[PDB]
Model the fold of this input.
Amino acid sequence: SQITIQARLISFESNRQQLWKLMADLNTPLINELLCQLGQHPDFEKWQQKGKLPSTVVSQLCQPLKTDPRFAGQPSRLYMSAIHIVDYIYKSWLAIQKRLQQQLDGKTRWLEMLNSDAELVELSGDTLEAIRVKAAEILAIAMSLSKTLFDAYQETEDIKSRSAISYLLKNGCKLTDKEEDSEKFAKRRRQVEIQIQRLTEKLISRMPKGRDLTNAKWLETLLTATTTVAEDNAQAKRWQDILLTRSSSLPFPLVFETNEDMVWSKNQKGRLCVHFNGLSDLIFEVYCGNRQLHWFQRFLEDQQTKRKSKNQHSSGLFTLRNGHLVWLEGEGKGEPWNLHHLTLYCCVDNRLWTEEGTEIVRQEKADEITKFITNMKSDTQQALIQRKQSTLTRINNSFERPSQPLYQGQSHILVGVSLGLEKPATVAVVDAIANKVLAYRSIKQLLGDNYELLNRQRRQQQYLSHERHKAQKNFSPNQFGASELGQHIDRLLAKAIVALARTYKAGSIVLPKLGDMREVVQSEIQAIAEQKFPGYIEGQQKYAKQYRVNVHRWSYGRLIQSIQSKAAQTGIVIEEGKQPIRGSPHDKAKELALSAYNLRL
DNA sequence: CCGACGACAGATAATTTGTCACTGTACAGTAGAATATAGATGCGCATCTATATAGATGCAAATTGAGTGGCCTTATTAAATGACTTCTCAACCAGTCA
Done:
């Protein structure tokens, strides 16, 4: 449901320079608090096993750095911004590492389980029919299915008769009469080996890096490498890998996770202003287009409404949720605080705009807070329960807000969206009780006046990829791509799909479980290419470049998110299902929506 | 002296020619014409022949499009572009101050 809106902040130099000095000084303990985990912390491998960072460890590394002679000059809210960012860095990276570990194991199982029909006969000492009969018994026992069969191979080895359980699993949890081609099986088993290899490589990841602004390592390395002689090829390359590294120009943003830690006001000139907790001397002026101003007026109205009411209304329902203050990169020459541009990005929960939507968040938080208090039931823990119960009481007192009746769709009408390489979207609206398609749309309809933009995107990707190649050979800085055009097209389709869902009173939009299509294609094309260029690895990589590149450029996750966002701002439910391997783009969309309807029970 | 033969002259019927009177006989519608044959020549109709085939067939290059087979450098770092995944996104109470 959340959105991010933005404004540039304007102030006189003294204020934009003082804030830069604090952020160039704050950017450094964001580096030192990474290193205090990256190599200093002894428990680190226990966290990599569990997949989660302990909720207090970054604060317990930061608390003694608050008096460090290098870091002591900063407000209490700038240290909380440091702790926030470093918590979110590790809390992300450990959660990436854990899903990779789980995938590697979850296929190391399957590379053991996957056997040819002849190997099952040898391993069982029995007929492939005896295996078909035992596979029929195992389905009769089971009737969670695929997991239950995996568990019944992980348990219940059963005098190697788990051979028949692998026979079900390789057949997609079904009986098969046909006996398989050993060349097709060799390609299949090789794809798993490739996925296993690729996972054992990706299992090791570069320990998350800090944004060093100082150039000190680079300058020290330059004067070392030019005046001294390396003792090894490894040392001479270690200096090369440092000297090639581009250094950052921007400090990490400030994060203000409490909405009240931004204070709003109106300037004499009638313009809006803002100030931050601990920087309450530095008034900043808001500059934003009238297409976004209504939120910045709402910020000040939410604040005035609470202050006019003796704090009896809660910022648990303030339209602003959190702010990220960032320096966007400028152009040309000048001091960093005169060259770059302070920009304030406000997280906003869009459903807090209206009274009917605010009531949803009131019920959502009142249920979550009630459960929290009953799960809790020590000294400061009682003070925390005072924060919570003052919220649980205050959240019932309403802000005066715009009214708009909630959208309601028919529980039987669904929009199916089918994504692919040639057709980025294609739509079928199904009445699932009639089994009747109400409408279909192809791309030429689904973004209408804008259909020239798909042809533009394909021209621009091809044109600009060649210009980047020509530019790199000359060391030109000019490096451009179609990324913002692809982002616009994915947003045009997201608006049109939801406008169509509203038009037909659909209860939900259905999006495919595409999963990691990029890795799957990379393994399939490799297992095939190894049969056509054996030993010539450069020829294996050249086999289907344009197909592999087009799959790595395929924006399916960004279109899926663009539709999710616009649907949840409108109130339409999102649902999911398996996308058919065969059929036209329409048939894919039709069967996808009907499948998601069948999954209701 | 007697008998036989030739010269010359003289007389004479046969022969030829002419004249004269009496008479048998053709004139009377009448033989070119009829009736066979061989032998050569010419016009007509049939009965072969020798030339003249164009259509059909067999075959043998002459490409012609469509296949198939054989031969190939690779591993790190850094930057750029295009993508994917994960994480995060409290709110009021307690201690100073003009």
Remarks:
- DSSP finds 23 helices and twelve strands in chain A.
- The longest strand of chain A covers residues 2-10.
- The longest helix of chain A spans residues 76-113.
- The radius of gyration of chain A is 29 Å.
